[PDB]
Amino acid sequence: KNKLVVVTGVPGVGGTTITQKAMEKLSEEGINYKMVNFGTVMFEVAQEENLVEDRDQMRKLDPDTQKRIQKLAGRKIAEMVKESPVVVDTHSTIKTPKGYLPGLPVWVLNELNPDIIIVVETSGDEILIRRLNDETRNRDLETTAGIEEHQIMNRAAAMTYGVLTGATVKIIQNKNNLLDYAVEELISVLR
Amino acid sequence: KNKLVVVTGVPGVGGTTITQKAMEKLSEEGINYKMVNFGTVMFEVAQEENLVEDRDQMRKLDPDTQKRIQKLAGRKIAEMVKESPVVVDTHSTIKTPKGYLPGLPVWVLNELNPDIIIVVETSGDEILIRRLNDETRNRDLETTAGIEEHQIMNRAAAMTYGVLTGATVKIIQNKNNLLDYAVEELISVLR
Amino acid sequence: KNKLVVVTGVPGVGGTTITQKAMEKLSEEGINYKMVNFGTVMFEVAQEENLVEDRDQMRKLDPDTQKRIQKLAGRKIAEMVKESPVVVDTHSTIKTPKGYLPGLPVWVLNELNPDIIIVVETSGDEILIRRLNDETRNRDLETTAGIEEHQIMNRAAAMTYGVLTGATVKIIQNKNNLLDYAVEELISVLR
Ligand SMILES: [Mg+2]
Ligand SMILES: [Mg+2]
Ligand SMILES: [Tb+3]
Ligand SMILES: [Tb+3]
């Protein structure tokens, strides 16, 4: 009966920020979500199996071990759902030099059994300017067309996740100066 | 072999209207399709299995029995294909407050084995005005952007249905004052 | 660890042209891809199984036979990957009168196990004009809206292929008078 929600969005869209704010407001009503990052849960599984010491070593693990750690992380998260509602922070797809990499390939979905997939978006212009203004980020020259293409592929992958699991797929706009509206929309879905 | 065709479309697009007109034209050449609504077949299965009584509470039913009912409904429809060609009237996704809910999750597709998935569309403007003119409705604040987003997700879910079953995915425009053109296109696909 | 790459694109986009140029340049650094057309491998499998003698007899084969040959073709290609990197030339979807037909249904994906799905594109205008200038072609002109709709569905099917296999999905623009840029992008992905 506790929900398992996946919250996704391209870098810079603010998915974790609105999720953190929604969780804190829900906590006031006695609804206590636990938030986890899928990549961090993969790192915790790999450390527990003595495969890695640091998070940087994760990207050098072979593909069969990666698929195995991915299945184990999905199972570890499915088990957390018995203790409370859970929100998973991850990417619908990651934009790599070899193309869009699904964040939840079918073997992860079969272990996770998510109830809702949330896709947080805004316009390509708003994302591009947010990334330009972030000092911790490094300039790459991704265009608004490139960001829109990533959001097109994220929506299609998220819809495929819904077909394979039965989860609903919710799209929420997190627009500049309208953060509170995105937080209220997310609270309603998480409740 | 008799065709199993799924006809989908957002509320107000007119998919069942053009399907009924297509079927009467086809019966004049001895091709007799049987049309069933997936939700009605699920409700008949739930009644046949005595899991439910007052249909309205179907949405508030245990997810495991819903999945079982969904599989039984897909199987019941696949069996009808032995008697005649079949049209399944359903939604590619239903736009709910928790997001886009797939009408045919992978467990349904595996029982149904559809040959063709039809996606009936028109512009967001035409849908919005049709809904405003319908007296049966309750006026919500759905925009043309919201309708276009639903049609984007419906196409992606329908394409995923095609990949998982091998079915072709046909998109038909049912535009204002061009209903007969949509009917002729649907007849050609159903023949 | 030889890669299996699928290169797709609507008729007239020039995907096999840029692939052959990229393979030529990769050979200079000692990387020798083998290119195969998926439809040709199905035809070779059907000749071996004594189901056909000529390529024009393939279309008549029943759906169960079609599925069996498709699985055997996927397996035959997966075996070629042991000898060298492999590129599969095929369509993400084929635009037929009954709708968009997936080129790689889930049963083919499970045998192929592709590493990368490449989607080669350009604008609907550039494709339409290229087709009008091709003497091999007939008329039955698709509009730019029809071509854009095919590219929308090809992206969604390709993203579904990525979710089901874990493959990355790369989109490459092959624009008029910028062929060398598309070749360089494809070399980087194929390496
Ligand atoms: Mg209806
Ligand atoms: Mg070709
Ligand atoms: Tb990182
Ligand atoms: Tb044999």
Numbering used by the authors:
A (entry chain C), B (entry chain B), C (entry chain A): 2 to 192
Give the published text.
Tb-Xo4 is a cationic complex with nucleating and phasing properties. In particular, we show that Tb-Xo4 may provide different crystal forms of a single protein and correct the often-encountered defects in crystalline order that may result in low-resolution data as well as twinning.
In the absence of the crystallophore, no crystal was obtained in the same conditions. Because of the presence of multiple proteins in this fraction, it was quite difficult to assign the protein identity to the crystal by using mass spectrometry. The protein was sequenced using the electron density, and a search for the sequence in the genomic database of M. thermolithotrophicus matched with adenylate kinase (AdkA), a trimeric enzyme that catalyses the interconversion of adenine-type nucleotides. Finally, the straightforward ab initio phasing of the protein AdkA is an additional example of the unmatched phasing power of Tb-Xo4.
